[model samples]
Target: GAMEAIYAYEAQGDDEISIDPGDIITVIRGDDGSGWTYGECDGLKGLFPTSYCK
Candidate 1:
């Protein structure tokens, strides 16, 4: 069975963001170290920071 949530880094912030299944996110960029910048998926635009994405 698949997990409920995935551990994806914020790519910008040190805080770990949670992404639920069936969520729609607009990836503006990508990060090699951490994760990507997923807007609306973890939080709304401007609420979180924009960096990189998958």
Candidate 2:
């Protein structure tokens, strides 16, 4: 998929967002050494699992 797709990620934290399969997310960064990544979706910002993004 090559870093493509909006992702069907479930919220990992209360601050995170639950993106519907059809929703869109603006990616901040994904190459973090940590498993979590900084991503923003629908005006919501939080750390989402890199494995979950795509």
Best by TM-score: 2
The lDDT of each candidate is: 0.37, 0.62
Q: Over 4 Å off in model 2, which ranges? A: 1-15
Off by over 4 Å in 1: 1-17, 46-54
lDDT of 2 by residue, 1-54 (tens): 123335666776786656555445577876578877666766777766666656
Error of 1 at 28 (Å): 1.7
Q: Per-residue lDDT of 1-54 in model 1, one digit per residue for the tens?
A: 112223333334444344544434654343344433424454443222223222
